[PDB]
Amino acid sequence: MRVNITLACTECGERNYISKKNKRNNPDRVEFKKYCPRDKKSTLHRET
Amino acid sequence: RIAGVDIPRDKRVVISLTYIFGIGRTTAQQVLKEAGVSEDTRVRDLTEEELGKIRDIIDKLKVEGDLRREVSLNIKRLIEIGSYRGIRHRRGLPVRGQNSKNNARTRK
Amino acid sequence: MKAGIHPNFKKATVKCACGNEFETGSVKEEVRVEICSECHPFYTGRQKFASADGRVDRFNKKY
Amino acid sequence: NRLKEKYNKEIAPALMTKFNYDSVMQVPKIEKIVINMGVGDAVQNAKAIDSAVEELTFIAGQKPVVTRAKKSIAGFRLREGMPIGAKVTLRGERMYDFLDKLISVSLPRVRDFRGVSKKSFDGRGNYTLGIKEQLIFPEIDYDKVTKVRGMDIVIVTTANTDEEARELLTQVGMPF
Amino acid sequence: MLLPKRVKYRREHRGKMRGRAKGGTEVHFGEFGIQALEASWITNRQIEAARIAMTRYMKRGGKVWIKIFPSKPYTAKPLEVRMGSGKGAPEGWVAVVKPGKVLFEISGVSEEVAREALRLASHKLPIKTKFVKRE
Amino acid sequence: MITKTSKNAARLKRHARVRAKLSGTAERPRLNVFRSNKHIYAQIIDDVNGVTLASASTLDKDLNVESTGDTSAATKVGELVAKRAAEKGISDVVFDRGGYLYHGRVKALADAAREAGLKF
RNA sequence: UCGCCUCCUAAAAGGUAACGGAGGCGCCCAAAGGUUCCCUCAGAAUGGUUGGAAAUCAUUCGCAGAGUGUAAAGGCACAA
RNA sequence: UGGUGGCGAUAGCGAAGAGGUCACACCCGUUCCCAUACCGAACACGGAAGUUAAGCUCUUCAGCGCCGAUGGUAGUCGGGGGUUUCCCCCUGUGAGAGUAGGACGCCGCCAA
């Protein structure tokens, strides 16, 4: 059953991103590599 | 192994040879008496020359599939002869003649 | 030819009960043979033992 | 190697001059040998694949390939997933080594073998054997081996018609 | 009683008829045929009644050679209902017949008995009708 | 007569597959390779008119290589097509493999183009 | 029955009604996305095991009968 | 003769026959590059004993498949009638395998 996830950036703390994920298929905390407009580079993004 | 099928390993030869098809205790006794194995032998200790000569003497005797095909040939011969006794084998009833009502229970 | 997942084989030799030698590659190095092709009478032209076993009861009562 | 030289030297020129082929190199030749398990116990016992991974690695010097059921069959209780069977293919000199091991030890070690029928072809010249036991050589761990099941062998040649394949396998030494 | 054993859609439009038949303009399989001149609907019961008329008068023949099969279903609402609220239930099947359509073919029966059989069965159909022989 | 698929049919299939997204235009031509088992061929093709600006092959009458199809000979014929570009300067081209995978004599040809400075 | 998608009615552009004729949706996918590289299915015939019309294989025919996450229509094997 | 493009298969699928000294491709061996969940079957690496049967190119056929007009009809824009769930006549337009036939190839550029 899919749920909404906001993705806070690793070092700065600005989310800027939402996604859908299945907690049955991915019970872990997801790690992406996404552009952060405050940090001006692609940075690792944490599932909150 | 001997007739293409395996052998027990840790028992005497005069008993172990009875495992393979179509050969028996008295026959194994009378062949191994002239073979000279003293009727107590493990197969883990033997010689290749005595293994070869028992291989050819059990090769000459009627052991492996030939007894099966022989009795099959006689019994199918009895089927196309018919002649009552073949009907008894086809029906599964006892053949040598007995009281077919009381026990009759080894067959069918 | 991916190394480490194929089992190794050596140049093995094949020894028969009649002393026949033959060559192959296998896991072992030398292999016993109980019965071989030229020892089995079925390969060697006509059969030798089942030729003697191939008789039938031709109504032989006369003795 | 040895069967390559033997194959050339006393199979090729005799039959090509016997049947008057227009070119030498259109002689028929055995191309490959493919081995099939087809073992359907994975619904009952799913762990029996590595079972005879060990002795097909004993047969051939390279690992077998697990086959894949292309669809799901309910009556056989076969869902999609849980792959069935195991295949391997032999070519080069390993196929000739397999023919040496098949002729020399295996068919005499089969204790009920009689002359196979002439009509054992698939209709084009490609032959299939079925061998019902694992008994090829006595180091197969027959004493504590688990299963007594069979084996499918398909030898595949480039002979277009059946007669060329039949005479080729008689020159190889298959008893009919 | 002629029935298509399966149909895609059991309700379909009534359709319009105009112009001659696309095929079946000539008697080809028997030797005497019968032709429609006016276009209308012909039902299962009309086909069956004509076949019983032909077969029971001739009492003999090669075969009867019906040349049309009803595929169109027609629908009816139940009686005395306010009109609307959805299309009605399928009631029966209809073979659409255009002019120049051979309906029935006859082989192996002689002149006057064939004429009498075809007149006797063409009286059982709602459409104007003409005899024809094979060229 | 078991059916062996021909090399050239599969090569034309994958060559059409790689051709489907690139074609040498005017001032942006296409460098095409043939890797036949005795000789190596390279061409510069303009698509819109079907002309060949320059070409090079190992079966040429001077500065021949003895191995005739080694990757060293591929670097040599890359040098020759580089001088063919040196008379007819374009100085840029889009590489087109034949579906021949970018490991072999095609890789030595491309590396010869890079070493001579032919911009891919 | 009330919102959204697909076909016909829809009259060879688009649009078009009815308590007209058929279905479906209120999701799923951390790969069932993106890129680079490599092929080809469905079905049928024949040979061989407990192998059985039909597990798995090998060969022949096979322009699309099969796939394309799910309803349908339009497209696709120079792959979608 | 090879490489390489365009033209709707008038280019195809087949039935026959030749060719290889140059090329193309069969073949040979996996020593390292590489690779097949199995492999030198493919992908690669580097050679050239012999081999045109296949791939390839030429000569032939209407077998299959493909392309395909003139009048002929069905349909119909626009008029006009009739016993009008549909017919008939006009100045126009005009269908589709079916037949006339075409066809088992036409044009480029580099290396012989």
Add this chain to the structure above:
RNA sequence: UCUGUUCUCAGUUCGGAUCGCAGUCUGCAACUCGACUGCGUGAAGCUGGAAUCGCUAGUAAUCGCGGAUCAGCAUGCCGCG
């Protein structure tokens, strides 16, 4: 029953029934329908639910041995240790 070797807990060297081959005896004749032997084949059966039977100074249980009808045929019956 008493002394030696083996088997070492198994469908086994248990158990012996069905089945094929070859025989011996009796009898005019062993298929319907006799007994016995040499082989080979080796089955179910791993001490048995509801219930149920016999047994008090050689008694139960086992082990054999005779005999009777009868050319031949016992696990039946009678008797003996």
